[PDB]
Design an enzyme around this catalytic site. Structure first.
Site, PDB file in Angstrom:
ATOM      1  N   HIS A  87       0.825  -1.179   0.000  1.00  0.00           N
ATOM      2  CA  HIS A  87       0.000   0.000   0.000  1.00  0.00           C
ATOM      3  C   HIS A  87       0.875   1.251   0.000  1.00  0.00           C
ATOM      4  O   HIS A  87       2.077   1.198   0.268  1.00  0.00           O
ATOM      5  CB  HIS A  87      -0.952   0.001   1.203  1.00  0.00           C
ATOM      6  CG  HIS A  87      -0.267  -0.042   2.545  1.00  0.00           C
ATOM      7  ND1 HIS A  87       0.267  -1.197   3.083  1.00  0.00           N
ATOM      8  CD2 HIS A  87      -0.075   0.923   3.477  1.00  0.00           C
ATOM      9  CE1 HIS A  87       0.776  -0.935   4.276  1.00  0.00           C
ATOM     10  NE2 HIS A  87       0.596   0.347   4.529  1.00  0.00           N
ATOM     11  N   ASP A  95       0.224   9.660   8.764  1.00  0.00           N
ATOM     12  CA  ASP A  95       1.233   9.449   7.705  1.00  0.00           C
ATOM     13  C   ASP A  95       1.996  10.744   7.413  1.00  0.00           C
ATOM     14  O   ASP A  95       1.475  11.638   6.735  1.00  0.00           O
ATOM     15  CB  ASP A  95       0.573   8.970   6.417  1.00  0.00           C
ATOM     16  CG  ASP A  95       0.077   7.528   6.495  1.00  0.00           C
ATOM     17  OD1 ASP A  95       0.303   6.863   7.526  1.00  0.00           O
ATOM     18  OD2 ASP A  95      -0.533   7.058   5.505  1.00  0.00           O
ATOM     19  N   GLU A 180      -4.468  -2.849   5.780  1.00  0.00           N
ATOM     20  CA  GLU A 180      -5.637  -3.434   6.435  1.00  0.00           C
ATOM     21  C   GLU A 180      -6.548  -4.115   5.422  1.00  0.00           C
ATOM     22  O   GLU A 180      -6.734  -3.614   4.330  1.00  0.00           O
ATOM     23  CB  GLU A 180      -6.398  -2.342   7.177  1.00  0.00           C
ATOM     24  CG  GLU A 180      -5.667  -1.892   8.429  1.00  0.00           C
ATOM     25  CD  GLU A 180      -6.222  -0.614   9.038  1.00  0.00           C
ATOM     26  OE1 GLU A 180      -6.863   0.167   8.331  1.00  0.00           O
ATOM     27  OE2 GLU A 180      -6.033  -0.404  10.254  1.00  0.00           O
ATOM     28  N   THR A 336      -6.978  -3.361  16.329  1.00  0.00           N
ATOM     29  CA  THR A 336      -6.559  -2.061  16.814  1.00  0.00           C
ATOM     30  C   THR A 336      -7.537  -1.547  17.871  1.00  0.00           C
ATOM     31  O   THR A 336      -8.333  -2.340  18.397  1.00  0.00           O
ATOM     32  CB  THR A 336      -6.304  -1.083  15.640  1.00  0.00           C
ATOM     33  OG1 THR A 336      -5.727   0.102  16.169  1.00  0.00           O
ATOM     34  CG2 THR A 336      -7.587  -0.741  14.880  1.00  0.00           C
ATOM     35  N   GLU A 374      -3.149  -3.402  18.491  1.00  0.00           N
ATOM     36  CA  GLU A 374      -2.366  -2.158  18.440  1.00  0.00           C
ATOM     37  C   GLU A 374      -3.225  -1.052  19.057  1.00  0.00           C
ATOM     38  O   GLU A 374      -4.460  -1.175  19.126  1.00  0.00           O
ATOM     39  CB  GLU A 374      -2.081  -1.764  17.000  1.00  0.00           C
ATOM     40  CG  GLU A 374      -1.373  -2.816  16.173  1.00  0.00           C
ATOM     41  CD  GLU A 374      -1.128  -2.385  14.722  1.00  0.00           C
ATOM     42  OE1 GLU A 374      -0.461  -3.162  13.976  1.00  0.00           O
ATOM     43  OE2 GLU A 374      -1.582  -1.276  14.337  1.00  0.00           O
ATOM     44  N   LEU A 377      -4.537   5.325  18.125  1.00  0.00           N
ATOM     45  CA  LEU A 377      -4.010   6.693  18.158  1.00  0.00           C
ATOM     46  C   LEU A 377      -2.873   6.833  19.172  1.00  0.00           C
ATOM     47  O   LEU A 377      -2.758   5.997  20.083  1.00  0.00           O
ATOM     48  CB  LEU A 377      -5.127   7.693  18.452  1.00  0.00           C
ATOM     49  CG  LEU A 377      -6.233   7.682  17.375  1.00  0.00           C
ATOM     50  CD1 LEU A 377      -7.450   8.487  17.809  1.00  0.00           C
ATOM     51  CD2 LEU A 377      -5.716   8.216  16.046  1.00  0.00           C
TER      52      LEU A 377
HETATM   53  O1  LIG Z   1      -1.407  -0.212  11.823  1.00  0.00           O
HETATM   54  C1  LIG Z   1      -2.627  -0.226  11.075  1.00  0.00           C
HETATM   55  C2  LIG Z   1      -3.474   1.009  11.369  1.00  0.00           C
HETATM   56  N1  LIG Z   1      -4.191   0.833  12.645  1.00  0.00           N
HETATM   57  C3  LIG Z   1      -5.063   1.970  12.966  1.00  0.00           C
HETATM   58  C4  LIG Z   1      -4.241   3.241  13.117  1.00  0.00           C
HETATM   59  O2  LIG Z   1      -5.089   4.341  13.430  1.00  0.00           O
HETATM   60  C5  LIG Z   1      -3.499   3.526  11.815  1.00  0.00           C
HETATM   61  O3  LIG Z   1      -2.639   4.653  11.999  1.00  0.00           O
HETATM   62  C6  LIG Z   1      -2.681   2.320  11.366  1.00  0.00           C
HETATM   63  S1  LIG Z   1      -2.059   2.641   9.671  1.00  0.00           S
HETATM   64  C7  LIG Z   1      -0.414   3.338   9.684  1.00  0.00           C
HETATM   65  O4  LIG Z   1       0.672   2.551  10.187  1.00  0.00           O
HETATM   66  C8  LIG Z   1       0.876   1.357   9.413  1.00  0.00           C
HETATM   67  C9  LIG Z   1       1.940   0.515  10.111  1.00  0.00           C
HETATM   68  O5  LIG Z   1       3.064   1.335  10.413  1.00  0.00           O
HETATM   69  C10 LIG Z   1       1.218   1.716   7.947  1.00  0.00           C
HETATM   70  O6  LIG Z   1       1.317   0.516   7.169  1.00  0.00           O
HETATM   71  C11 LIG Z   1       0.154   2.638   7.339  1.00  0.00           C
HETATM   72  O7  LIG Z   1       0.532   3.181   6.061  1.00  0.00           O
HETATM   73  C12 LIG Z   1      -0.094   3.824   8.271  1.00  0.00           C
HETATM   74  O8  LIG Z   1      -1.144   4.650   7.739  1.00  0.00           O
END
Ligand SMILES: OC[C@H]1NC[C@H](O)[C@@H](O)[C@@H]1S[C@H]1O[C@H](CO)[C@@H](O)[C@H](O)[C@H]1O
Ligand SMILES: [Cl-]
Length: 485
Positions: A87, A95, A180, A336, A374, A377
């Protein structure tokens, strides 16, 4: 007491390897990881960006920066969770950096724009390739699934020594935007903002043709996508589809929601079968990521889950279907929202992360899967850490042996200097003692067996048996019995 120990992993920065595929942070990370080790951390997680590694052309894999990164992880004495990140980084919350999918893959899209998930106004999302092209040989002779499989094979061959040394212990397979297993139903770049219901992203020509074939196959070739669904930023009451007693309950609506969520499950299954074949015989766990769509969980239509592709309602378990699909592969669920309380969310959003977490964890455990979580936030505070602790051991400490249920791991988002200095670090280190049930760090906990081959393929009708009857989740303690203090 040792059965209670929950491993703790930390996510590395998004640019642990630079956007030009060079390893630039060796001095900074060496210090930062020494601090994680001093805090008892079991390992780190890292994005292995498709855009970086296969960026120059088909099968031109440049692993050399990741090798430098991984040598440093090994020298520190930490385990490693590698994400196969198919992705784009960018557009999704948090990001800071910008890493598209390979340019040569995007170049195919200038001729065939239907390679991208497409919304009802025709907008093309460039962050991930549509599951519509999983088996379409559009990419200089290869299909999307072949691309994913070849990438994993090249990873295996190049990182063999880190695999054999037991450094790499987990392969998280990216299955969609942000890694995801979902549709891009809530994109900030297309103007979505929290807590909009999102949209169905099934308008690419490949998925349109798939729908017509599925519809004809049940004697309704005329049927079309629902068109009473509103837009990204609507609320459910403002649409005829998602409102209470809305058209999501109709025969047509049911058929559409099944088709949309089924395609995601089939996408996961296909890709996991290839991943399992790749990593056969290695001491690793395969994982997927389920997105935590907690908003609108408190209304009958579960609108934002439906648009993400999770067909979850009061009487239909849209996560246990997914878990049942995962069972044959012996794949784990990484979820998450482990840090969230319902009281921290805004009323407008109709948000229930605690119940969602309970539902997904209970679905994994009922299917016999390892489940990890995980934080959604950034959080540095005792309360967040206590919320995680509760979810890590939902029935508390068992003094005799292990508890009835526990997380297999927890990964913390995200490493920075802020985490490893000041009171933040004191809180974090205390949190890690508590996840370890106040025992010292044990590198040999949770040993993996050689990955067996996936069990027999089961049909979509077999997977869907898990949807009903929908069971109440296992009871969760309100508060952890081993708080940070
Ligand atoms: O880790 C998946 C996702 N979980 C919910 C969180 O609010 C998101 O921030 C993350 S996405 C985030 O981190 C990932 C792992 O480092 C990356 O692959 C992805 O590009 C990010 O947007
Ligand atoms: Cl059951």
């Amino acid at each position: 007491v040792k059965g209670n120990y929950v491993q703790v992993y930390v996510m590395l920065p998004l640019d642990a390897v630079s956007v030009n595929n060079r390893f630039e942070k060796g001095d900074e990370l060496r210090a930062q990881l020494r601090k994680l080790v001093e805090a008892g951390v079991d390992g780190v997680m890292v994005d292995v960006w498709w855009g970086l590694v296969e960026g120059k052309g088909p099968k031109a894999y440049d692993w050399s920066a990741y090798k430098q990164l991984f040598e440093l992880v090994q020298k520190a004495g930490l385990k490693l969770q590698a994400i196969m990140s198919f992705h784009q980084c960018g557009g999704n919350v948090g990001d800071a950096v910008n890493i598209p999918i390979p340019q040569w893959v995007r170049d195919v899209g200038t001729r065939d724009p239907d390679i991208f998930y497409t919304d009802g106004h025709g907008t093309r999302n460039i962050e991930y390739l549509t599951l519509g092209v999983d088996n379409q040989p559009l990419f200089h002779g290869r299909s999307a699934v072949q691309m994913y499989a070849d990438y994993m094979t090249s990873f295996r061959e190049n990182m063999k020594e880190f695999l054999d040394a037991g450094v790499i212990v987990d392969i998280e397979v990216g299955l969609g935007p942000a890694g995801e297993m979902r549709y891009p139903s809530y994109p900030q770049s297309h103007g979505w903002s929290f807590p909009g219901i999102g949209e169905f992203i099934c308008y690419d020509k490949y998925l349109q043709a798939d729908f017509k074939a599925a519809a004809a196959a049940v004697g309704h070739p005329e049927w079309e996508f629902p068109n009473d669904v509103g837009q990204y930023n609507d609320t459910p009451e403002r649409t005829q589809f998602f409102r209470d007693n809305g058209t999501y309950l109709s025969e047509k609506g049911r058929f559409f929601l099944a088709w949309y969520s089924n395609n995601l499950i089939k996408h996961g299954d296909r890709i996991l079968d290839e991943a399992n074949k790749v990593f056969l015989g290695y001491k690793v766990q395969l994982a997927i990521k389920i997105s935590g769509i907690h908003w609108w969980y408190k209304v009958p239509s579960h609108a934002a889950e439906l648009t993400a592709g999770y067909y979850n309602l009061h009487d239909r378990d849209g996560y246990r279907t997914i878990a049942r699909m995962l069972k044959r592969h012996r794949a784990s669920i990484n979820f998450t929202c482990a840090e969230m309380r319902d009281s921290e969310q805004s009323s407008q959003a109709m948000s229930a992360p605690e119940e969602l977490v309970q539902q997904v964890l209970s679905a994994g455990w009922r299917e016999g899967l390892n489940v990890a979580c995980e934080n959604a936030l950034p959080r540095y505070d005792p309360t967040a850490y206590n919320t995680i602790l509760r979810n890590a051991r939902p029935h508390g400490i068992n003094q005799s042996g292990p508890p009835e249920h526990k997380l297999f791991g927890f990964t913390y988002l995200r490493l920075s200097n802020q985490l490893v200095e000041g009171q933040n670090y004191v809180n974090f280190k205390t949190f890690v003692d508590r996840m370890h049930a106040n025992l010292p760090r044990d590198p040999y906990v949770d040993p993996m067996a050689p990955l067996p081959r996936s069990g027999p393929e089961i049909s979509i009708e077999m997977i869907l048996q898990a949807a009903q009857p929908k069971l109440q989740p296992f009871p969760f303690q309100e508060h952890t019995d081993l708080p940070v203090g």
